[model samples]
Target: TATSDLIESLISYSWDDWQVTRQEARRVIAAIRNDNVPDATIAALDKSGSLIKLFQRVGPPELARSLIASIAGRTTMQRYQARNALIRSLINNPLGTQTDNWIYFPTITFFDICADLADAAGRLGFAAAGATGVASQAIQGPFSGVGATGVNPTDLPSIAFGDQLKLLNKDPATVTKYSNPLGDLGAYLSQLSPQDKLNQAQTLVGQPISTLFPDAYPGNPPSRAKVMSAAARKYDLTPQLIGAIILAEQRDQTRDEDAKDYQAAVSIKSANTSIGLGQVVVSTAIKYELFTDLLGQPVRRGLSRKAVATLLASDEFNIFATARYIRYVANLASQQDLRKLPKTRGAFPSIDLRAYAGNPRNWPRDNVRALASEYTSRPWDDNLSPGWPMFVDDAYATFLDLEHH
Candidate 1:
């Protein structure tokens, strides 16, 4: 019982251990491999800043893999964040360099579990934030892990699903042509029923950034995503971060946009309502002084109800404004543009920082301004920002079917 209990504590880490640093995680893996340490020893080791013994003796891979799999969160929203931290930690296992593949078996088991998670999450939405990239890399790495390596976005859609599956699984029988990096990830997919694997495979790597948005909308000029992409480029934001925001807001639907805009305008007239693709609320619009020229009369750079109505209809302006806001948030939190931050295993990505207020200060500080509570009156531990609830929500789910068609 204490064993299962010990594993749970590591997976659902204590609030104080919120960020889960690489050094700590490495020690977690290393200590487990070397000495089969316990929670108290790890805590004591961390407290004293020196290594020592265990409260209970457990063998290598015995405790660690159990904890790794048990990382499923209390809430659907938090599941990916906890898993993401662990994936990030192990993907850069420094132990491999020292022990000559000491990290291999445990990590392979870890990757195996992760692939199962990808399958279980049903279309990889749950594991998308946590597993996809690192697992691909791990598959490419020598150890046949579920985490590690890089994948080309172009390659995702280019290869046939059958070919790609065979590559990941390393099945000579299947006739795969390309030497893809997501090799072991295919093993994870190979177990899935053909129909199920296709869904998961598509989610894992099928849709590239270019295909995520329409080439053109009826009202806009050619190349629609460039409007957002250009904004991201200007703000030094990445597709993942920028896409997270747009994705979080359910930006794909526009058929009822006029009605949506009208309701938003009325809501703003009565109170605050989010505007446009970026979901810039009226309050934020007022705070930011969005359209000084447009708000000609007595509003003093604030969005008038009528102006809000018109503004929500303009994609380029709305996205640009959101991009500016995102950059502002990035500059304030991390002291540079998001893209300027290192995109390494241990480093915090722009989206993670934006959601967490400042990267690595998990269990939100009082200083966090973009808290979900501000919008929803509920307390969120990690985030509810321009994007969060890492899994796809009802809004995003609706957007997905529309995107596929």
Candidate 2:
């Protein structure tokens, strides 16, 4: 045990002076491109929570390109980890902010943006990699010759879902996108003063969903606490876990700059975006079978994402849908992923949820956004939330930061 701990310390310790050098970080990154990542380094990064900083410190622009090129050599498992690690950052982070005389707005784009780039690089680099020995047996048959699709499917977001979810929808009449300066919440929250908005957000915990939507349900409406408790019990989780996540999700972080936001625009459209207090996406909702009608029945099939969005608008259904989706994703996550996260009062499942959701209020916005803007021209997406607008990184952090009755 002592020897193992000492070796881990040598790899990269938390202490500033003993940590791995940036030059070493660069070498490790290049090794990753070669698909020969040292297992010890992955262990060290898991300990330090330094993988993004490691890549960002070296350069995501380069990491992105390197990862794209390295796809042919990556095994299915390696490809899964490599791409997801990046996707986690991309989706979980913001693209950029737009400011006009009108309002300050944040944005989130799609991974297809990166996948498109990844495919182009893999196809173009096919020949270039021949001389370098970067090509592997993985691409031997179909992609062995010129003009082959060298990018592995495991490595990139499939164009199928990507195409379906873009600005263009199959049923244009039924789908509505969130394209706004202030989000769905911010649009209404804008009606209040700075102090008033804080008062509302601060008091949001311990209040009922009926507080936000009086007709949240036809009969006796449940409070936010009741919904979280009921769902957590249904899923074998703690109500505080659900409550911790909601309080995290409800924050509007752009207010950090001006301490006030006021806006009303048609761009907010319908509830098709990350809708309502707990924040759930339609595609994910469908995948997890979470979206429900106001009566709490699973939504009938074939309703457009917009229609489902409309159905879940009730705070009652929205909270339950959000909980259902969280359980689904957490189930898909690897034990390593759950264990890899730095722990807080909140569980790793909740922490991982935040990592998937995107930027917390303290997320390195300028850093991540700078790189996000560098790669894609369409840096912002109105169809999505930049993040859940979580004030802290996750539930445990939220548990500490959020003041409740």
Candidate 3:
């Protein structure tokens, strides 16, 4: 009875693998009903590299060893040690894993059949992709070529799930429940104020439009418009949005004569706050491979001390690097929007409206909106809560700095 129950559980678990499910169930049922279960499993194992592959897939040594003991009737230390070693070797080595190209076989066949039906539909002038030459061209082959299909079904589960959750239903909460490795909790924390405001005040007193933008600004009537406009284009953001962010974060830097005073005040305050430019911390910067600029690249692993020393001595580089980082994060948010907006979930979970849209209290909304304005230049999305209007301002200021450079 116990053996039958265990066999049933294993069968249920293996449903994801259709071929293996039927094969294994047949073997297990026959073994328990006829003679020894161990003999049946051993017979299956002896046929191909099947047992090893199955063990590897369902592993973490202990589980594999237990399964081996149950199925092979070899529960001794020596047997376990050997099985353990084999499992360890598989874990350590990348080459031992089985590829699931077989899964795509069905998908490829389905598309081929669909295309044939679509071609018949095209004769009646109803095939859209066929008419445009894109759909017909997409499934055009008798054989699925590697480059032609762009079909890499390695993470098909995540992809299929993401499509169902994101495109079919625009609901984040439901998507999160189904998707593994769900949303971040840190989204609750509010955006903090910049540490260098007083120094910023000192910098703003002496500057004007002319000296502020020397290269990009023309003459008597100084206009930051040119520099700002250029930066916005380069980053695909809006000048007004950039101005708003900079005003909030580095208001002092905007004064033509105040750049040094602002820098000094920011540096001094940053010493107290343990933060650096754009309100980012040295620790945060380090995450983005910040320390390896000395090598003209991020330092390789095991080169920590060298990266640290180099980062401390280079302020300008650090500032520029941080600005580059801000632009990068903003760009990432925009790209994520392309993948997330309208469509709700698929491989990746849909944007959690509670985490991103439903609660205006969420900082990620501010972050995403600020970045979106770089491309759209409109006000932050109406969905955002006003707990931190400062986020908008800071984002706008960063936009200005990013645009000018």
Candidate 4:
């Protein structure tokens, strides 16, 4: 009774207390491995579901499944090998340490389960049943039969479904023939099931744009919405449109990080380079007199380029600078020279047009490009200026989607 109580207590122990829990679980597992625990007792534990529960509590479901299979081996050698493999898996991958520690096992386990399910389905003449049934079976337990559920679907555990998908779809050959596996996995998952699509849509809708792009701010940044709203009010710009611009810029910059020499070059360039959430460069800062009246004085002449850059990088000042820049652009757009551009008509429009049109005059186009050029000297095609409207349309759609969902 004491031994049975010990096993049950260990199974239910808090996993957060890792050291004590691990030690106790290991002790019980060692007893089981050494044959110290009687066969009768093992059978009773198995029949009672305590043994499987013990393994599940000690580690991830996949690891627990492997352990259970290993323990059920006929030969001592087979059992020993299983025990060794379990130890290796735990030691190598580990469990929740805040970082991406357990990433490897989820990938390995997902594929292993998928392959086993595929094989099982093929054997059972259910290969044509589709992945839903197979996935359901895999979650329940190792595929036994077409409809034989081994474990409760509700009890099935996963660290991250998305991460697993990322790895599962990552085949170098497939990627070479097609495109990025990470990208492909996202597309695949979206179409995997109705539930999958719903979950993804809900997650996207529920999360704020700031949360979606955590790296948009470097450290201890203020609330993005607040900053954008403040800028919107100050510059007569749409907060959503400002948000869209930030997203687009970050996306374009990060997309090429994997390119040769691009990562290093960008890192070097970012240091005191384009400062702030709006990615304002030094020239734009000076041209806009962005540093003026920091404390009721012309801070532009007093502050060094680095000092000005640092100031512009702050959430408040960066936003203020962005608003000022927008205001400047708005002023330019209203001038007789740029007045002929198509009027802004979208939910969010360019600073100049106030509304976007189908064949907007090149006026909004010219001004936006002129403003954009002050930040980066990179080559711009015809598509560059219209990017403002494009970004606005994209963000507006996202806004509406979130509201509806």
* Local error of candidate 3 at residue 351 (angstroms): 13
Clashing pairs in 2: 92-358, 208-223
lDDT, candidates in the order shown: 0.35, 0.35, 0.32, 0.38
Q: For candidate 1, lDDT tens digit of each residue in 65-123?
A: 43343332111343444444444555434231112111223343333333332233232
Which runs in model 1 stand beyond 4 Å of their true positions? 1-220, 251-261, 264-268, 290-303, 335-389, 392-405
**Candidate 4 C-alpha lDDT tens digits along 1-405:** 345555666666363754335466565554444444434445555556665455445564434433343243212323333333344445445441111211222332322322332232233222221111111222111111111221211122342444334535775542232221133322333343544433322332222222111111222223445455555654566554454444333323211111111111123343334533455665677667863322223223444454455444333455557656655655543443333322322221344433222112233543343334322332221123433444334433443344345
Q: Estimate, for each residue in 1-405, the C-alpha lDDT of model 2 and write its tens digit.
A: 232233234345464655455555445534544333334444445355554444333333333333333332332333344344544544444332111210121211112222322332223221121111122222222112111121211122223444335534554421222122234543443464655433433344344342212211222334455555566655544454455455444443211111111111112443234544454555555666664312223114444454445434444456667666555433432222333333321221233323323322322332222212211111121121233332223333333344332
* Candidate 3 lDDT score relative to the true structure: 0.32
lDDT of 1: 0.35
Candidate 3: tens digits of C-alpha lDDT, residues 1-405: 344444544544443654334446444534433333444443444343344445444433223322332332221223333344345446545332122311111221222222232222223221221111111112221111111122211111233444444534657754343222212212311322333322232122112221210111111211223333333443344445434443333321111112212222233233211121233344445566543322233123433432232232222223333444445545444445433343223211333333332212233433444343332222223233232344444444444444443
| Residue 222 lDDT, candidate 1, scale 0-100 | 21
Rank the candidate models, highest TM-score first.
4, 2, 1, 3
Off by over 4 Å in 4: 1-221, 255-272, 291-295, 337-392, 400-405
Q: After superposition on all CA atoms, what RMSD does each candidate show versus the true structure? A: 23.8, 25.4, 27.1, 20.9
Model 2: CA > 4 A from native: 1-202, 210-219, 253-272, 292-299, 334-405
lDDT of 1 at 244: 41
Per-prediction TM-score to the true structure, in the order listed: 0.31, 0.33, 0.25, 0.35
Error of 1 at 83 (Å): 58
